[PDB]
């Protein structure tokens, strides 16, 4: 967590239906956006911090 | 000399400008554009904004 | 493995979506239709509905 990894996602298409239809998550909280709207939104960049 | 008339026009214009500019205020919402709120948020969360 | 739920490891991924004025480069699996001009349409340009 102190050296949390960051990856930059750009210039690609993502099917977020797979992500939020998954039952493998205990926490899935989206602020400022809805999980079911991501398939209709285009973003300049995404950062995945793990 | 015609300022009295022009003044009136100016005032009206000013008022409308302010009105239009108020559409760019968030008033606490995440966005001042209704289309962005509706396209990003579910109805339960969109109605709050 | 014997720890309680409050101390078991949890893997966390935080997705930060940035919507700037720059060209969009991460999109959903939504197919683009033909461009229709001179008509009243319901357009969606890079999520700008
Ligand atoms: C990398 O990804 C791999 C694949 O990911 C999948 O595909 C991607 C594209 C994406 O969609 C992902 O969301 C998706 O998961 C990972 O491999 C997968 O790993 C999964 C778990 O990490 C695993 O699912 C689990 O499988 C177990 C075992 O299933 C077998 O036995 C059952 C009988 O029990 C059979 O019916 C199955 O056919 C299998 O033969 C299963 O028990 C798990 O279900 C439990 O957990 C679910 C939530 O995860 C619950 O919804 C469900 O109700 C059930 O609940 C149990 O657990 C409770 C405790 O939590 C307990 O109290 C309760 O009583 C229940 O007993 C779960 O389904 C996938 O099978 C597996 N897929 C493959 C192909 O291997 C891989 O791990 C990933 N790698 C990394 C590093 O992350």
Curated annotation (Swiss-Prot), chain C:
Changing residue 7 to H: In strain: Omicron/BA.1, Omicron/BA.2, Omicron/BA.2.12.1, Omicron/BA.2.75, Omicron/BA.4, Omicron/BA.5, Omicron/BQ.1.1, Omicron/XBB.1.5, Omicron/EG.5.1. Changing residue 49 to K: In strain: Omicron/BA.1. It comes from the Viruses. Residues 21-43 are annotated as: Disordered. Attaches the virion to the cell membrane by interacting with host receptor, initiating the infection. The major receptor is host ACE2. When S2/S2' has been cleaved, binding to the receptor triggers direct fusion at the cell membrane. When S2/S2' has not been cleaved, binding to the receptor results in internalization of the virus by endocytosis using host TFRC and GRM2 and leading to fusion of the virion membrane with the host endosomal membrane. Alternatively, may use NRP1/NRP2 and integrin as entry receptors. Binds to host ACE2. RBD also interacts with the N-linked glycan on 'Asn-90' of ACE2. Cleavage of S generates a polybasic C-terminal sequence on S1 that binds to host Neuropilin-1 (NRP1) and Neuropilin-2 (NRP2) receptors. Interacts with host integrin alpha-5/beta-1 (ITGA5:ITGB1) and with ACE2 in complex with integrin alpha-5/beta-1 (ITGA5:ITGB1). May interact via cytoplasmic c-terminus with M protein. May interact (via N-terminus) with host bilirubin and biliverdin, thereby preventing antibody binding to the SARS-CoV-2 spike NTD via an allosteric mechanism. This is Spike protein S1. It comes from Severe acute respiratory syndrome coronavirus 2 (2019-nCoV). The gene is S. The chain holds residues 499 to 547 of 1273 of the full protein.
């Amino acid at each position: 967590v102190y050296a949390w990894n960051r990856k930059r996602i750009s210039n690609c298409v993502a099917d977020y239906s797979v992500l939020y239809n998954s039952a493998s998550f205990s926490t899935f909280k989206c602020y400022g956006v809805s999980p079911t709207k991501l398939n209709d939104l285009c973003f300049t960049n995404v950062y995945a911090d793990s | 000399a015609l300022g009295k008339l022009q003044d009136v026009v100016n005032q009206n214009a000013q008022a409308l400008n302010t009105l239009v500019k108020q559409l760019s205020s968030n008033f606490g919402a995440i966005s001042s554009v209704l289309n962005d709120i509706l396209s990003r948020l579910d109805p339960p969360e969109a109605e709050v904004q | 493995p014997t720890y309680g739920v409050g101390y078991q490891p949890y893997r966390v991924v935080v997705l930060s979506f940035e919507l700037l004025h720059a060209p969009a480069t991460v999109c959903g699996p939504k197919k683009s239709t033909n461009l229709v001009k001179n008509k009243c349409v319901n357009f969606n340009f890079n999520g700008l509905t």
